[PDB]
Coordinates of N, CA and C in Angstrom, one line a residue:
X2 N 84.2 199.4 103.9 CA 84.7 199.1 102.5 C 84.6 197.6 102.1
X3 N 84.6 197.0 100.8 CA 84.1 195.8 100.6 C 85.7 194.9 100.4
X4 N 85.5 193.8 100.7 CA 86.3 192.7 100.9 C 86.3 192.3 99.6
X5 N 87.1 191.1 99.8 CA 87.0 190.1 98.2 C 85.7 189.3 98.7
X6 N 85.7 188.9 97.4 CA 84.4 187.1 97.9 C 84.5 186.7 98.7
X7 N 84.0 185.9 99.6 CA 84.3 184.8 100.7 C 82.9 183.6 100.0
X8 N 83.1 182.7 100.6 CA 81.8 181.3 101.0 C 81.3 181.7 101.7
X9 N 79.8 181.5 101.1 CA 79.0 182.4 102.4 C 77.8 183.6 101.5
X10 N 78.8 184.7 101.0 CA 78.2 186.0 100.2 C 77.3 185.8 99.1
X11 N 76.3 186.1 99.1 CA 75.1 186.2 98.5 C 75.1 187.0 97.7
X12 N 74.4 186.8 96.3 CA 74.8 187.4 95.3 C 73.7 187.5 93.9
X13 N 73.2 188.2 93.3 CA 73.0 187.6 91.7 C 74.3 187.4 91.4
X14 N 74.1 186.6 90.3 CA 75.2 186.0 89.3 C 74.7 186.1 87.7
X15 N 75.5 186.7 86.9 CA 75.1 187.1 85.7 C 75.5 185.6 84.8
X16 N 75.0 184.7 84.0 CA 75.7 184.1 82.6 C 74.9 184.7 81.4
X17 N 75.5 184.7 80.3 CA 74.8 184.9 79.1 C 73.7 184.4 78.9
X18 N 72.5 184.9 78.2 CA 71.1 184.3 78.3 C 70.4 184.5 78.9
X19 N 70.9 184.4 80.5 CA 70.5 184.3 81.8 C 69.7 185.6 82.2
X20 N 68.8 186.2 83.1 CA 69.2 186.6 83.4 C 69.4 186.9 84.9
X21 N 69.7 188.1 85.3 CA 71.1 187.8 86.7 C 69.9 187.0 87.9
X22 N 70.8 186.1 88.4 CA 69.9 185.3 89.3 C 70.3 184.9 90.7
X23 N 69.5 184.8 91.5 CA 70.1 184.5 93.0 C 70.6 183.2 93.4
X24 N 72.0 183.4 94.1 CA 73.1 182.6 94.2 C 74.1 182.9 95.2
X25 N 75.3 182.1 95.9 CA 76.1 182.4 96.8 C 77.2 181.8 95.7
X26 N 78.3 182.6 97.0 CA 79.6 181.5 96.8 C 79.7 180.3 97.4
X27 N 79.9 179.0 97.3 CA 79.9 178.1 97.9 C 81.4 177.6 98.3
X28 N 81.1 176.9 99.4 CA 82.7 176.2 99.6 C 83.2 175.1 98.8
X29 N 84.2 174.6 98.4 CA 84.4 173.3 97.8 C 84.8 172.7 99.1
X30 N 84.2 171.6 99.1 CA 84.3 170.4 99.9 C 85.9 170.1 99.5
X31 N 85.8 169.2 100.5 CA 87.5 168.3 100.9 C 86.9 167.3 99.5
X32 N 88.4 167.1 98.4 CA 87.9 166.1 97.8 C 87.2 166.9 96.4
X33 N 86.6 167.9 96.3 CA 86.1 168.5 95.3 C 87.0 169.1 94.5
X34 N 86.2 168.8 93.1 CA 86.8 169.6 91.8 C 86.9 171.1 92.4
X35 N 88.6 171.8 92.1 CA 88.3 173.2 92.4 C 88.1 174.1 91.6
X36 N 88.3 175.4 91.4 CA 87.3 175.9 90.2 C 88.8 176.5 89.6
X37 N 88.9 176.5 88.4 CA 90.3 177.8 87.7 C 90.5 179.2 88.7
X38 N 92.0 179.3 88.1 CA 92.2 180.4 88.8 C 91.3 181.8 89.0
X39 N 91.4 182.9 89.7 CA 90.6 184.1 89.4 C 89.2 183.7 89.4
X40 N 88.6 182.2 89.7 CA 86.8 181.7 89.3 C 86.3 181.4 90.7
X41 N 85.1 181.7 91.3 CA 84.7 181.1 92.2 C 83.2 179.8 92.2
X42 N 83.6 179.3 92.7 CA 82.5 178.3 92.6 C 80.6 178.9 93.5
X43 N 80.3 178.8 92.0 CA 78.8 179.7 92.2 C 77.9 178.2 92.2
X44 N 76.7 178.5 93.3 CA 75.8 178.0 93.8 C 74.7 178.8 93.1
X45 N 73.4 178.3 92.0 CA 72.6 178.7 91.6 C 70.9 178.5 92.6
X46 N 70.7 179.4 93.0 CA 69.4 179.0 93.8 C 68.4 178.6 93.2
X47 N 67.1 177.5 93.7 CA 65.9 177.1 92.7 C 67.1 176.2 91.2
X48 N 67.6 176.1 90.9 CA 67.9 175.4 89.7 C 68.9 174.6 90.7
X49 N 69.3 174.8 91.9 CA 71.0 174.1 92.2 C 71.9 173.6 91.3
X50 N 72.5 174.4 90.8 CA 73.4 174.3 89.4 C 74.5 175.0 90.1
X51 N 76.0 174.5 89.4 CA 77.2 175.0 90.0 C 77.9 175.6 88.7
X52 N 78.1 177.0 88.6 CA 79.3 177.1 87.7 C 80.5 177.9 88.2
X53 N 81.5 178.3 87.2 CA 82.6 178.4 88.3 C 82.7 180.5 87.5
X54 N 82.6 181.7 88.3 CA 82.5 182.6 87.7 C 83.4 183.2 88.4
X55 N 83.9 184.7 87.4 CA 85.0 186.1 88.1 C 83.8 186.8 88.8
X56 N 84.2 187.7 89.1 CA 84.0 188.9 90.0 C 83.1 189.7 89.1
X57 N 83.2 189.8 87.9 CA 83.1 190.6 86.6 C 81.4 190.0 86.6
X58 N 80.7 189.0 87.3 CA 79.6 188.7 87.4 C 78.7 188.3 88.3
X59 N 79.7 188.7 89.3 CA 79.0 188.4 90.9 C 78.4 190.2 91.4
X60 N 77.4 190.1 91.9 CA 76.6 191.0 92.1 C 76.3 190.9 93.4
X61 N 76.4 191.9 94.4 CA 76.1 191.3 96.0 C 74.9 191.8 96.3
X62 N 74.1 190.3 96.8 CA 72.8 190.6 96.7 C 71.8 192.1 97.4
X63 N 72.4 192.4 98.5 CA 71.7 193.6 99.3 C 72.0 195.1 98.6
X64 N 72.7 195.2 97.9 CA 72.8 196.0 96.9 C 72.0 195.7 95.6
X65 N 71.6 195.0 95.1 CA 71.3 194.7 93.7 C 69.7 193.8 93.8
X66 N 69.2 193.8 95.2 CA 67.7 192.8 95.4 C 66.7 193.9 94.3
X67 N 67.1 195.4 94.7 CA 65.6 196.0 94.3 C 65.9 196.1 92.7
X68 N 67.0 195.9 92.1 CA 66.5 195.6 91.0 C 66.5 194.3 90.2
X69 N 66.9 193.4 90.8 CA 66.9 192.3 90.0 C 65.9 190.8 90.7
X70 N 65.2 191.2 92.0 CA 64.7 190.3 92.9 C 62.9 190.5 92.7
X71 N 63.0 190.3 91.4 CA 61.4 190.4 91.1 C 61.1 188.8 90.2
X72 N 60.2 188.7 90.3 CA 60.0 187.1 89.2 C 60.2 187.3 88.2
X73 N 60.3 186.1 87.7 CA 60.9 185.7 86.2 C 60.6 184.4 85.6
X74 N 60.2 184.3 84.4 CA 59.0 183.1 83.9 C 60.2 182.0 84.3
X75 N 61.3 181.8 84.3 CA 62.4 180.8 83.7 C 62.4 180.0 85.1
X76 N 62.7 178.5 84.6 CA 62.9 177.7 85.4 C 63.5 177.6 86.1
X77 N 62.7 177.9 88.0 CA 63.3 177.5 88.8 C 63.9 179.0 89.8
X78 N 63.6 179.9 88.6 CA 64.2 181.2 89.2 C 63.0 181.6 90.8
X79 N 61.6 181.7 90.5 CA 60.9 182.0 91.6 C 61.5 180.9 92.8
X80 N 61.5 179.8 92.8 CA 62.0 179.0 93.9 C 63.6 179.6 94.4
X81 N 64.2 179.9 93.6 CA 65.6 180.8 94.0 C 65.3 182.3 94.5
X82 N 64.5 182.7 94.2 CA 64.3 184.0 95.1 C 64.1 183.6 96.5
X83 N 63.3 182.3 96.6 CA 62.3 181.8 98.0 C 63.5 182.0 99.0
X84 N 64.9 181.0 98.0 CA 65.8 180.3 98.6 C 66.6 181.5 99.5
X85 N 67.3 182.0 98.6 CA 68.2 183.5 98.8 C 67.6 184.2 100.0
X86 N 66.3 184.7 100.1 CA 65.6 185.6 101.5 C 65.0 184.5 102.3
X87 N 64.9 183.2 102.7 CA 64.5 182.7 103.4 C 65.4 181.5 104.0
X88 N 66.4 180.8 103.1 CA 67.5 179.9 103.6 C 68.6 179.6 103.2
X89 N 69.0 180.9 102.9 CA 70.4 181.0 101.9 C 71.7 180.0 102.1
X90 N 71.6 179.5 103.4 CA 72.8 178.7 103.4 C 72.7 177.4 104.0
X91 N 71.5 176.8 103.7 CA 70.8 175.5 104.0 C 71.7 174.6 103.0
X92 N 72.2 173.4 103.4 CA 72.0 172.0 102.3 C 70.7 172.0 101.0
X93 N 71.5 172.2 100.4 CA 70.5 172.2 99.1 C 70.7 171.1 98.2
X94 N 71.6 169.8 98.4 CA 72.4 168.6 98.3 C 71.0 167.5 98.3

């Protein structure tokens, strides 16, 4: 059965406009802004962009690759597919 989030879990992540794109949960560093309650701090792959999301838009990736892990004209998204199946939890800093 599935757990909550952790740092680490790989995911699409849905924003408006968007669409769903490959991303983890990241840690917040010692010293780092934390994210609001109920929000976790999302790591965007190919764009490295941080925003802070619920559950209500985290999508775990091994479930959700065959339909949403195909290209997409938008910037940055093909280099975040690369990231997600080849070095998902590298320094991207």
């Amino acid at each position: 059965m599935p757990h909550a989030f952790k740092p680490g879990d790989l995911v699409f992540a849905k924003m408006k406009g968007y669409p769903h794109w490959p991303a983890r949960i990241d840690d917040i560093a010692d010293g780092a802004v934390k994210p609001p309650p109920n929000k976790y701090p999302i790591f965007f792959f190919g764009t490295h962009e941080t925003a802070f999301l619920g559950p209500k838009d985290l999508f775990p990736y091994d479930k959700s690759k065959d339909k949403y892990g195909k290209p997409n004209k938008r910037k940055g998204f093909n280099e975040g597919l690369w990231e997600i199946q080849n070095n998902p939890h590298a320094s991207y800093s």
